[PDB]
Symmetry: D2
Subunit: 331 residues, 4 copies
């Protein structure tokens, strides 16, 4: 009887929500379109809206939603940078799924590092055509190199542990360093500049905020070591992509793996192979021998997707029963 409208849905999302939703007393409607100001009108008559990471939940969208009497905005993801929280004004509540599986993203990040370092993705395309030459595929041992992690949160700290198992030296930067964890894991907090100057490999694992937007830009990349391997499974807006293209052309950047991209919203998760990709930077990034782009799949495991579904359904059950909202996103 609680009526739920879901945006940006794929078949994998739907199957999970139908299966696990069978034990909840919900009406579930599934839409393919992203939630934006153009589609916000479709929320009319629903109690709960379920949004995802690439929905444009700006003021206009939020106004139309409150106007339509929406009681709850449920985000089926850990990120909320794309919802303009100040504009909600407590006219409805916002919940997210914060800890479905930090391991999924940390593990993926390690995958991406090794893929671009050891050029696994290029190897595969060669051996498929029967090219078994390995010229140009030489990488570097991670062992005893320095990895620099920006964001020592749930994901960042698991990433650090893994890398320490590789016997990498790890340095890290966080707005709120946690020295205890550093002693347990065996890593040293440093400034951003020290991280840039000493890191052979750099990974972004902080949220997108006003302070992190474009934190990786021409100026910060000039401070990195030539041949630095950079990986981003955070948010696309962490990197000024145009500057990334230049730092690739300058051979500052040894290789880069991007699971997210600043203007990904009309592309990612969709098969755009039969039309023009209109974003110039995205097209150009796809033509670099040492760029690996994957469509925001760091989160994408069966454990992670399972927990997102269950935690999302419970977030909603908990709201309708007037229970305390453990996964509220404070506004």
């Amino acid at each position: 009887k609680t009526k739920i409208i879901f945006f940006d849905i794929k078949d994998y999302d739907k199957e999970f929500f139908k299966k696990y939703g069978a034990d909840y007393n919900f009406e579930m409607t599934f839409l393919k379109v992203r939630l934006t100001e153009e589609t916000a009108n479709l929320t009319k008559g629903y109690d709960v809206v379920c949004g995802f990471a690439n929905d444009n939940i700006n003021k206009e969208t939020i106004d139309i939603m409150a106007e339509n009497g929406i009681k709850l905005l449920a985000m089926r993801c850990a990120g909320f940078n794309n919802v303009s929280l100040k504009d909600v004004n407590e006219r409805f509540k916002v919940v997210r799924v914060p800890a479905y599986s930090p391991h999924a993203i940390a593990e993926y990040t390690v995958g991406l590092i090794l893929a671009v370092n050891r050029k696994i993705n290029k190897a595969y395309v060669r051996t498929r055509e029967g090219n078994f030459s390995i010229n140009g595929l030489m990488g570097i041992d991670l062992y005893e190199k320095t990895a620099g992690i920006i964001g020592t949160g749930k994901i960042g700290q698991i990433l650090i542990k893994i890398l320490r198992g590789f016997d990498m030296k790890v340095i890290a930067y966080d707005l709120f360093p946690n020295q205890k964890v550093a002693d347990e894991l065996g890593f040293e907090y440093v400034s951003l500049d020290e991280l840039y100057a000493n890191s052979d490999i750099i990974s972004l694992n902080c949220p997108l905020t006003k302070d992190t937007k474009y934190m990786i830009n021409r100026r910060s990349m000039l401070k990195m070591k030539d041949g630095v391997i950079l990986v981003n499974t955070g948010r696309g807006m962490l990197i000024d992509s145009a500057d990334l293209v230049e730092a690739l052309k300058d051979k500052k950047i040894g290789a880069v793996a991007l699971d997210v991209y600043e203007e990904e919203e009309n592309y990612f998760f969709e098969d755009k192979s039969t039309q023009v990709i209109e974003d110039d930077i995205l097209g150009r990034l796809l033509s670099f021998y040492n760029v690996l782009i994957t469509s925001h799949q760091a989160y994408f495991t069966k454990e992670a997707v399972g927990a997102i579904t269950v935690t999302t359904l419970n977030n909603i059950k908990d709201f309708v029963e007037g229970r305390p909202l453990v996964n509220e996103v404070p506004q």
Copy 2:
């Protein structure tokens, strides 16, 4: 001192020229693999430098001793491809045993995650502008069981890394080392227990008489359905034909092979403008869940640097009558 090198590529040559400039050697580089058909080209040389895919059987060894070869220097850790009994001490054999175990262990982890998370497939889709991720869902390695076969230099580093993923690790070795298993946090088990309880299995033992085709129809029937298998050891560890069947019957979830049982005429060479004659290799290349890379687990700067220097020193040490630290006993 006159050195004949087989199976050489430009990356090998450049390294051996750069670092060999300090040593008093004549160095001749050949592209061709060392086999019975090419063994005759060793005539007039003091030292032969061989590599992992050379066929150094009795015929090859006989022709070499006949030509007065003093030293066989292997620029690799593996020596399964030298028929040691047939040497008869007519010349010495040296290898480079520990250039970089990290290179291979690290690459092994790279393969696991690539096939699990479909990173190679992702790339091929996004390059064509297909950003759909349907079918690319993987599994968290966290709290799964990895089973390592071969707890040597490489296998032990692999185990440590995976323990960092908080995987449970079980292992099998012909010569268990219980002490390392206590430090690392893993348990030796029989092969049968490994097969039954492993979500991921990695092969890191040498190719011997005992390991040849250990992974075959019968042992794969004991694995968990959906098992992820990775081989950076030797290709002959797997009966490849059975592997094909175990893929087709969906016993195998995904597999990454950095080596292959008949790789000798393919690997390291660009065969993209001719027929691949080996039927199994062609067929393996057509499976959605098979990742084949051309024996590049070892292939890092550090590893290749250390192979070159250790090889050149193996040879310097032999010619100066020094004790051979890296002899392979025969």
Copy 3:
């Protein structure tokens, strides 16, 4: 009732059908003996080239009172006609666009000769080396066409424009057309011995099944370029693999494949391809496989939809059957 439907099929049939007084039901699944039961309560069953319309399927269909089998294709080798027994009628679309297939055939020839597909994969990765991509001029070479029909004749005309010499084999030669087009009928053996390029454009029948097999390929010139936009069963695929391995076959393009029915038109990129020969064929440097898309142009598909839609409109109005397939 429509089988083996894809979104392109559905959009066309809805757009053009929205004039006609029909209720149309669309199914994704192929028509086989397992799915034939789903025809219950329908009068029009619309089938396509890879449906298994054997006796069991036909029996279940007649049992369910099926009035018309409408084939949205020109080929009908997959419908066991003798078993229908006139318990319902069969219509096809015979001439929607012979040009579509003939033109595509020429595309394939040139793609495998000049390595265009391999070129694309290289340049996409920034490999602009053209080593191994050398081809041959078609000019003054000999092309051998098996099946001089609607498609075969247009193929011949195009190739004659390339100034290729053309020879051809047909069970029912048409000497006239040979004089207009400038080509010579020969035996199969002569075709095999003198052809640099060979194309198959005859129907799959009892007599053409496996006509390309180890024995006939041994008669071909080494380095022959072979293209098949006919039916997969024209080639013994296992022998093709051998003739590729022997380097008898210079390059081959297959738009059709003998066991294509559970693969073609479907995205199988997230599961095992169980057919061993198909997997193996995909690993050869000089094999080009496309998924039965020689017919696939907007004119062809438009004409298929209209001719089909008003093949049905001409059945329900008790009109004579302009496009039947005689049993």
Copy 4:
């Protein structure tokens, strides 16, 4: 005896020139580098220089060559746009191979048309991964469509004949129309503007000159039919590539095949797959779903390459024996 220096050589070139050159009284030296001002010095002590399509044979290069006493410049190609003829003040002679195989290029042009129309290259990349879906691969019948050929020379005429065999209607533009050939082939000369307005398919087969440089640019592409299929096996400089990108993005261009590219000289024929492609437009062109780029291989058949080698060697023999130079490029 006669000493020949060859630039921009690949193994295929060398094998042909060694095989066929064994009968001629020549010393033959092979270099990998392109002939530019930076390399022109390497001509010192040679009688004959053999150049190829992407050599930068400007005045500086020509001056350094005449200074070194070079007697003959032999181009192993039909194009000569890249040699600044006015600057060669008859201080040496220039020969080319004009008619090695017009069929090779015309045939390849037809291959490209059908590949981008019927998506054969995209089909291949799909089926290789076991994607047999044909959605998005629908093309058009060429039958009864209009093809527009710019340049009715040796190549253009054979192209026209072939297309007439497809029963296409053909129109053509040439600076020097040949009405007789039009009557034999069945095509009509028209203005460029009429060609742009009525062509479904357009092919470029004129030389690169001062008059053809950038003839295909924003303005001319605005006159084409929406969804036009464009193919260029002429010269890269015939197209303002930046405008091409825009005309692709705005969907004026249905599909394009480029065998040549305006800044191809440091890329084409070379394996650049293990480094950054520094040219932005080329990278971007490689990321369009409906762009097919091949590396200047329209000429590349065994008959063509054979004839280039023999005709080149005879051009040179004929020069040294004071024979009249039938393949001189008038300066």
